[PDB]
Amino acid sequence: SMSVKKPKRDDSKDLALCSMILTEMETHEDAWPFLLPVNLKLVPGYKKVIKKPMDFSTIREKLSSGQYPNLETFALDVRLVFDNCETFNEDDSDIGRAGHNMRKYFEKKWTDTFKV
């Protein structure tokens, strides 16, 4: 409360750490469905069904331009990519399985990186 400060983690390295994680995501073999935005003009259903499209290149732009207030808003956008993928794709399709793989890959990196 007022004049009572909770000890809080050192967040000075978060930008660098999130960029590192995003780089590893971008270079993962199964990253290909997520490297660019879904083409809203060529993919029927997507624009109407997926209310908040997100992809790695958009996250990279936002990260490079100071549009993430904190590390949690970054993680939200990464998870949005995979939540969108699950909504639109069958689990056993190539894109669907890529998304599950990439979510697992992300969440372990997230855990290993930030609760030291």
Ligand X SMILES: CC(=O)N(c1cc(O)ccc1C)c1cn(C(C)=O)c2ccccc12
When asked if residue 110 is in the footprint of ligand X (CB under 6 A), the reply is no
Q: At what angle do helices 71-88 and 94-114 cross, to 10 degrees?
A: 160
- Contacts with ligand X, 12-51, as mask; x by CB under 6 A: --------------------xxxxx-xx---x--------
Applying CB under 6 A, does 78 fall inside the site for ligand X? Answer: no
- Measured CA to CA, the distance from residue 63 to residue 57 in angstroms comes to 10
Taking the complex as a whole, the smallest distance from the CB of residue 84 to ligand X amounts, in Å, to: 7
Question: Can you tell me the distance from the alpha carbon of 49 to that of 62, in angstroms, rounded to the nearest whole number?
Answer: 23
Q: Tokens at residue 113, please? A: 């990186």
Q: Please report where in the chains the tokens 């003009």 appear, as a residue.
A: 41
Q: Does 80 bind ligand X (CB under 6 A)?
A: no
CB of 85 to ligand X, least distance (A): 5
Choose, by CB under 6 A, the member of 63, 95, 103, 109 that binds ligand X.
95
Decide: 102 and 31 in contact? Cβ < 8 Å: yes
Q: Provide the binding-site residues for ligand X, judged by CB under 6 A.
A: 32-36, 38-39, 43, 85, 88-89, 95
